[PDB]
Amino acid sequence: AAQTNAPWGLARISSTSPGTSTYYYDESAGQGSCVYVIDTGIEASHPEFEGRAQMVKTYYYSSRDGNGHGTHCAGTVGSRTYGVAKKTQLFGVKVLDDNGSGQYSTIIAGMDFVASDKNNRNCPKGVVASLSLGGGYSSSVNSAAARLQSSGVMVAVAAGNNNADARNYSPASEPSVCTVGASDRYDRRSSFSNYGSVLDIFGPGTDILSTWIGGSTRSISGTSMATPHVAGLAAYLMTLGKTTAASACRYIADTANKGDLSNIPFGTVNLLAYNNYQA
């Protein structure tokens, strides 16, 4: 399948070269997979989700996304227009308040929630969790992300936006999960992206168009925006039978575009997520 005039980031993950605007993908489109978006919530009534999104948990007085961030991330995973895996099921877990903040104890609770909750959902092709959030190093936060991965969920996490070594941020620094940095439309590392030996992969993160609250759309930037590209890609590849939750991060790195990014510090991987789709 081909979607013309796609957002650049979707075009980039199905291309060997920058500078194109069509997204090419298998029509299966992540059907039968599930992606948890652990964030500020998801505006499930947004037409772009077509009834495929629902809120399953909140730790606040409401399950609604009063911020936008979670809706944007969810859109990049699985909206009709802006999403990687256009037929995936999206589940929202609201661990961040409407200011975008959350205590680590709540975040941990949300990750353990997903490890259990997947047993209540029909996801025959596999389960992914997308975590566009982080803060200073915490062994307890890393441990929770490791447990979620161990339970059979592909965990994708944002590297962080401090232009620093991700070793000092959590859950970015947990080795067993898939830590995602950000690139721009000219194949440069995004100027804010964290880096370091703990990164596994890069995805599009600068000027990413996706869904927003109030039934709207907007373009924003961050490792938060790269992460759902990789989460969506994992769901898409799992549906195709190419990989599993345990091995999807390694499979994505193995099949990535290699050596095409600039401003990659020495010791950081030069790997850009790629779907390897040949029509």
Residues designated as active site:
39, 69, 224
Q: Would you give the binding string for Ca ion spanning residues 90-119, x where CB under 5 A is met?
A: ------------------------------
Nearest residue (CB) to Ca ion, 103 versus 139 = 139
Stretch that binds Ca ion, among 9-17, 181-189, 194-202, 220-228 (CB under 5 A): 194-202
Using rule CB under 5 A, residue 155 touches Ca ion: no
Which helix H or strand E contains 90, and what residues bound it? strand 89-94
Report d(CA 260, CA 255) in Å as an integer. Answer: 13
Using rule CB under 5 A, residue 200 touches Ca ion: yes
Stretch that binds Ca ion, among 48-56, 155-163, 200-208, 224-232 (CB under 5 A): 200-208
Report d(CA 9, CA 190) in Å as an integer. Answer: 13
Which residue's structure tokens are 């205590």?
103
Report d(CA 253, CA 61) in Å as an integer. Answer: 40
The minimum distance between CB 177 and Ca ion, in angstroms, equals 6
Nearest residue (CB) to Ca ion, 97 versus 200 = 200
The minimum distance between CB 173 and Ca ion, in angstroms, equals 10
The minimum distance between CB 138 and Ca ion, in angstroms, equals 17
Which helix H or strand E contains 236, and what residues bound it? helix 223-239
Stretch that binds Ca ion, among 97-105, 106-114, 193-201, 205-213 (CB under 5 A): 193-201
Which two three-digit tokens encode residue 153? 């969920």
Task: Answer yes or no: is 16 a known binding residue.
Answer: yes
SS3 209: strand
Using rule CB under 5 A, residue 256 touches Ca ion: no
Which residue's structure tokens are 């877990």?
93
Stretch that binds Ca ion, among 47-55, 56-64, 162-170, 195-203 (CB under 5 A): 195-203
Report d(CA 97, CA 17) in Å as an integer. Answer: 38
Handedness of CA 258, 8, 82, 96 (dihedral sign): positive
For residue 143, what are the contacts with CB-CB under 8 A and spacing of at least 6?
174
Nearest residue (CB) to Ca ion, 88 versus 149 = 149
Task: Answer yes or no: is 171 a known binding residue.
Answer: no
For residue 155, what are the contacts with CB-CB under 8 A and spacing of at least 6?
128, 129, 131, 145, 148, 149, 171, 177, 178
SS3 2: strand
The minimum distance between CB 171 and Ca ion, in angstroms, equals 10
Nearest residue (CB) to Ca ion, 39 versus 174 = 174
Total residues binding Ca ion (CB under 5 A): 1
Task: Answer yes or no: is 71 a known binding residue.
Answer: no
| Strand 208-212 relative to strand 216-220, pairing | antiparallel
CB nearest Ca ion: which residue?
A: 200
Which two three-digit tokens encode residue 114? 């997903």
Nearest residue (CB) to Ca ion, 74 versus 131 = 131
Q: Which residues are annotated as a binding site for Ca(2+)?
A: 16, 175, 177, 200, 260
Given the rule CB under 5 A, which residues bind Ca ion? 200
